[PDB]
Amino acid sequence: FYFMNQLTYGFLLMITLLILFSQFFLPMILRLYVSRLFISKL
Amino acid sequence: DESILLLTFLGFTGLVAKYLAPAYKDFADARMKKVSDVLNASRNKHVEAVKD
Amino acid sequence: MQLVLAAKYIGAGISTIGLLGAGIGIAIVFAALINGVSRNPSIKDTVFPMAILGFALSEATGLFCLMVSFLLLFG
Amino acid sequence: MQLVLAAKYIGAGISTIGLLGAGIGIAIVFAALINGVSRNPSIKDTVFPMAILGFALSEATGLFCLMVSFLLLF
Amino acid sequence: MQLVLAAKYIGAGISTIGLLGAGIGIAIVFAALINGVSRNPSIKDTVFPMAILGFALSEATGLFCLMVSFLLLF
Amino acid sequence: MQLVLAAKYIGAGISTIGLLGAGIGIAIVFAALINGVSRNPSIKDTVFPMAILGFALSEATGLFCLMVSFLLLF
Amino acid sequence: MQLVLAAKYIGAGISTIGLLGAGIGIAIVFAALINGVSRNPSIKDTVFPMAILGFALSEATGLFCLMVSFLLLF
Amino acid sequence: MQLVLAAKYIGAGISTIGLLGAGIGIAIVFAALINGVSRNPSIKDTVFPMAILGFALSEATGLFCLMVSFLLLF
Amino acid sequence: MQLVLAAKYIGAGISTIGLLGAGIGIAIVFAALINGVSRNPSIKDTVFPMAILGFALSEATGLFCLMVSFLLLF
Amino acid sequence: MQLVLAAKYIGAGISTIGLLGAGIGIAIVFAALINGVSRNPSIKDTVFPMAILGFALSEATGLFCLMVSFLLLF
Amino acid sequence: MQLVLAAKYIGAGISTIGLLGAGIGIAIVFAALINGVSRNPSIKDTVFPMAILGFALSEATGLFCLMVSFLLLFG
Amino acid sequence: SAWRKAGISYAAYLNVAAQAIRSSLKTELQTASVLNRSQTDAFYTQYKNGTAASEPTPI
Amino acid sequence: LTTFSLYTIIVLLVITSLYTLTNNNNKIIGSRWLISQEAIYDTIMNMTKGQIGGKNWGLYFPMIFTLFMFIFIANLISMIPYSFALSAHLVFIISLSIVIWLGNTILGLYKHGWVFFSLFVPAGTPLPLVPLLVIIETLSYFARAISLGLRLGSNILAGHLLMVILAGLTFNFMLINLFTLVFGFVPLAMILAIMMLEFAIGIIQGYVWAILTASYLKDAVYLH
Amino acid sequence: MLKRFPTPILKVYWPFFVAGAAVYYGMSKAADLSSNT
Amino acid sequence: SSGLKLQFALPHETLYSGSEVTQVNLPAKSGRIGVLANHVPTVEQLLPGVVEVMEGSNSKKFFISGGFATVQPDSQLCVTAIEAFPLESFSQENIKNLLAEAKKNVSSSDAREAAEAAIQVEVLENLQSVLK
Fold first, then answer.
1. What is the DSSP code string of F17-71?
2. CB < 8 Å to L7, chain G
3. Key word Endoplasmic reticulum present in the record (chains C, K)?
């Protein structure tokens, strides 16, 4: 029945979270990594 | 029929507030104090290096 | 209808012995527990919550067994 | 309805032999108990309350199995 | 209703082989006793009471099994 | 036709005991987990996911039976 | 109506194999007896009487299986 | 014709439990894995590549019978 | 008449679970590989062809079993 | 006579899994090979023809089962 | 009595896999054979008669089952 | 065999093993270091709490 | 409108509700809501650093992150009793596994091509089982594909429907005669243990998904 | 809000996107061949 | 390490001490154990028998009167024992057998002498395998 429905909105939100977490949520914590490392190393 | 699983959920979350919440509280407090202590100590150390 | 609930009862019968690995499983966990304290005496209070971890989830599989035998007995 | 009580009877028959692995497991419990006390006689009856407790709750599986067979007879 | 006493008989037959678990396991406790005292000849018959206790309760499983078979026989 | 629903029920019953193979398997993982730590106490966190990971691989095999029961149940 | 003695005979057929692994178990007793004495030759008369004690009132319980195969044969 | 799909239902029921020992067997690979690193800590990421290989092959034993259940489902 | 193809389905059901033993078998061909090669890390290239020798010709026998199912399905 | 060919089909189904005796059995020989060379690499080819000799006259016994299947199929 | 030849057929089918009790059993002897010579390389010519002696009187018992199957096929 | 119960300690087990190995010597290769290595000349005397005396026996 | 796509919108709202309200004004100190995300990032980081072990190991580290978190969050919403099954749509999860497997095959053929078919020979073997070792490989090659999907949703679909029908147990136990209230505490603790199992069958199974496709990434990227 | 970074998802994650489009086309074939059950 | 550090040590002359080696072959309590360049840290008591030491060079054949093999966790295997031995020259049949008969005679004496003489018969019969 809703094979197209679930599949298409799942594809959209999968590629959405791909680009979203990639561009946003991994480097927003990698900034914390590099910041704490650069303060500790001076 | 479905509110009984809700009752198990409420009792389980009560046990979570009894058991899991102070443990994660203490883990977060310990890591917080550790990172804050190291971050203060490195700064004080190279302040003393500036004084040297 | 003179046959279906009788077959339900024998289906609850064959779905009762799958907790066989309950009566093995947790027990042989305890067996290594008896080994674990024997070759290492001060690890007992270390391992026994983990072993009771190694109890609990280890037996509940067999629970699934008899709840099939609880459902096809009744519905 | 001549078939259904007889089917309850053979259902209690097939729901009886779950104590096979129960006896196997408690035998492995006592076997490791002998092997543990052979290498540790010094700690014998500290393990043994825990050993017999795990024995109790672990044989209780087959106990519940044949009382399921009992209620399936009834 | 010729089927029902016949099915009692075959239910008795299938409710026999749970003692096979006892029939294995009450031997292996004494087998581990052989092994343990061959390892440790110091403590032979202070765990032989525990060994025959595990024997007794471990073959009581098969006792329960064939008495289920006997009560479904008659 | 009066048998095919009964055939679904007893086919669900014979499909059920596959979780048996989970319920033994996970156990020896925990047993090896004890022999991950009895002989090596300093490595247990190393195997604290790595044992239970194996749990989730064995448990799911048991979980791949009863629901094969359930589609024949429903 | 000649179903019931046929069922008695197949009931003797299913009350039969519940000694089989019992014949394994006493056997591994003897293997353990080898692990008794090929490892520890000094333990032999310490074990082998009591060990064959372990080889008796163990396996006779398994022999109970085939004597059930007589009482429904008659 | 109300009987042939009944028989393929119970044929899917008997072709279910072939996972059983495989659901054991992957675990026993894991058992050796817990005795692999607790014995040898510096092989931890050498065996765990091939062992999880040997996991999947031990899956490849006991999975296809499962889908024999599904194709006989349809 | 309706049973000649219905029985082929249940024969395909029973004639598939032989991989079960493969699900027990080749596992130790990996698992004794583990505690073998954890015991000697640089025996690996010595044994990993031999193990994948001792895998393959020990597995295909079970792969015969469902093959006997396949011809019995078609 | 309409039933005897389907009976032979399910007879080929039940005369199938004696390769189970291979499907674990010969595999454990290779398992004993692995340990048998991991602790002892210089005694590989001392055993390895003879051991693979011990392959054949085991596994062929299991092969007997499925050729029985053919004489109960054709 | 129209079934009794098919009864013999399927009785031969359920008396076929007793070679299972051969097909594993002698194999463990071969396992022990390795456990002879990998443990004791000076025991091989000691054990290689006896172990292959330990072949016959094991697996022939399993052979019994299928030859019973043979006398349950035609006999 | 049952030297652990009846005979020697394991150090003395290997000592008797060394005495048998050096006893199985080539007499050309059995040097003076071998015979002096087996020159068991130590004398043990068990004293008591009152500093009593046992026999100075050849070990 | 579909409740399923609305549930995916609720998932994205929780994704907003994991970092924006977490981060108090971009602070170094790492508050309590951020410690959990730190632990997740580290336990995926140190995992796939050792798993695929490549010089180019981090290049799929966001992907191995974001394929986890979907299963991590969607098994935190169906945990509610009054809810509909999120990831128990086996067509969806198995199709996700099909997408990941086919992307792995296209990556391996674009990276290696004909020598990507050199994965069919794991080790040197003597002759009468050299092609057969390929075949059981190919027999496992789609089994590498099919199982990982057909092993996640069949977990979750087996769980909550359990807590449906065993709720029916409490509809079949606490509806017979009044002495069912006597010693009727053990089905409550049994469903408690099933919920303990359900958090595991969400979280740890999502990690199983992650670790198995991480192994499959090392399979497809690196020819042995 | 969050500092947007040009993290590589087009020059890296192409074949999984290609596989998603191909599975959409396979679902077109399936829902035009097996959705009438 | 590439290879292994063998510390083959005796009370009179420690022959190898961290010598780089590929394989050791030693009669321990569990039987003849061959150990390659890497191994688990493992402690074994050594039965008197033939040790074969294979290196980058060929494999030397020594007899050992028992001892201990201990894998120091830096892959340094220490063989700590008593007796070294040539190819076969130190072994002489007339020396062994004429003493072995007398040792079977002393094995009939009191248990302090009998157990030790039984050990000596065992060692000389193991040395018969060195006579080969």
1. TTHHHHHHHHHHHHHHHHHHHSS-GGGTTTTHHHHHHHHHHHHHHHTTTHHHHHH
2. none
3. no
